[PDB]
């Protein structure tokens, strides 16, 4: 009955956003709510909410978020209640992915000692696990300097073997041509 | 802020969860949901009253109480490992806003052989990115763990830390492609290079691990594999 859209999106942060939530009957009130992976439920929206995102109904109801940040990447459903009391009938939920706008890029992949470290590349670029059943490797997080305003991504590979070698860490992934390999 | 409890647990198939959910909204409808892939929530019980239940969309192999206004419990009888899941309850006024409690981790399992604490490393800045970069990257790694329940934080000079911090959004598995496969965890803290080579400078990776409580049974030829903290540690340099 609940159908929401797209089904999933990334932006640059900064970007406005707007997701959408398409009810088949007439509805009575209707909630947002917003989750990371791991995190919990929580409702965003039964309208405003502080602000800095909003909402408009027309049944399609739809949810504006204003520029967009990083911290803004997680899971958002919508859930409709037909009724004061009637049980809430949950949308599919869309998935959002902020992604930094990273001026210098910086693509590099160093070696730390008690690991490889993939790192500062600018957001195009996508990181793929390896074919290779006994080497590690993580998707590209973005870590958020918030006191010199710095942001930038990164991702780890690693395994206990001696072949592996930080300059074939990221063979499956596409890495930028330029990419800098120390000696 | 509606409540649940016990955060997380680790049960033999057969064995009795009791899972408890309070709420002080004065709501009279709760609810109790189970979440994971690739079904969304699922409801299981609910109440529109004190001393009353309905049955769920799925309310087999799951029983509910709703002794008060206030309190809403779920009980797993005979424990299986399909009902390994998250569980949320929920509260709600009929006709306004519904809140969910912060959920319960639950783990279900044949035998408690499989569970594993994390052991865990933590990983210097490269001299090439401080040279580079003027910046400093430490990662750590949590290996090994069994099940997948762990937060992770930093401690810098003992007080925890946020901005430069990035976490993965969840664990990896060892052997991705099998069963009783166990998990792994890395996550990075960037700091500027004047502050890694503080001497003085002290940073701690702690994984608060979700594993066995005092109550089980153990015969294996080892720590318990308990609720538990495991850390990794550095100071500056240079």
């Known amino acids: 009955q609940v159908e929401q859209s797209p089904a999933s999106l990334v932006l640059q942060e900064g970007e406005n956003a707007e997701l959408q939530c398409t009810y088949s009957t007439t509805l009575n009130s209707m909630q947002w709510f917003y989750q990371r992976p791991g995190g919990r439920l929580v409702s965003l929206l039964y309208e405003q909410r502080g602000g800095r995102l909003t909402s408009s109904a027309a049944s399609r109801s739809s949810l504006h978020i204003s520029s967009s940040q990083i911290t803004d990447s997680g899971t958002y459903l919508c859930a409709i209640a037909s009724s004061s009391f009637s049980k809430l009938v949950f949308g599919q939920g869309t998935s959002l992915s902020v992604v930094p706008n990273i001026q210098n890029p910086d693509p590099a992949v160093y070696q730390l000692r008690d690991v490889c470290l993939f790192t500062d590349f600018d957001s195009q670029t996508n990181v793929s696990q390896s074919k290779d059943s006994d080497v590690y490797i993580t998707d590209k997080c973005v870590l958020d300097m918030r006191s010199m305003d710095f942001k930038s991504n990164s991702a780890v590979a690693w395994s206990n073997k001696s072949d592996f070698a930080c300059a074939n860490a990221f063979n499956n992934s596409i890495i930028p041509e330029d990419t800098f390999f120390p000696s | 802020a509606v409540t649940q409890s016990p955060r997380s647990k680790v049960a033999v198939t057969g064995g009795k969860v009791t899972l408890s959910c309070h709420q002080t909204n004065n709501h009279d409808y709760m609810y109790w949901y189970r979440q994971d892939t690739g079904h969304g929530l699922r409801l299981i019980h609910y109440?529109?009253?004190?001393?009353?239940?309905e049955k769920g969309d799925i309310p087999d192999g799951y029983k509910a109480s709703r002794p008060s206004q206030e309190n809403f419990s779920l009980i797993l009888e005979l424990a299986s490992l399909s009902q390994t899941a998250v569980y949320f309850c929920?509260?709600?006024?009929?006709?306004?806003?519904?809140?969910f409690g912060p959920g319960t981790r639950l783990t279900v399992l044949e035998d408690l052989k499989n569970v594993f604490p994390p052991e865990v490393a933590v990983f210097e800045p490269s001299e090439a990115e401080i040279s580079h970069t003027q910046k400093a990257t430490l990662v750590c790694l949590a290996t090994g763990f069994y099940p997948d329940h762990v937060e992770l934080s930093w401690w810098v000079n003992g007080k925890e830390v946020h901005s430069g911090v990035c976490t993965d959004p969840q664990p990896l598995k060892e052997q991705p492609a099998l069963n009783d496969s166990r998990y792994a965890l890395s996550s990075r803290l960037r700091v500027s290079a004047t502050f890694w080579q503080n001497p003085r400078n002290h940073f701690r990776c702690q994984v608060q691990f979700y594993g066995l409580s005092e109550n089980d049974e153990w015969t294996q030829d080892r720590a318990k594999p308990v609720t538990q903290i495991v850390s990794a540690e550095a100071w500056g340099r240079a």
């Open positions: 109440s529109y009253v004190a001393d009353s239940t």
């Open positions: 929920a509260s709600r006024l009929g006709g306004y806003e519904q809140y």
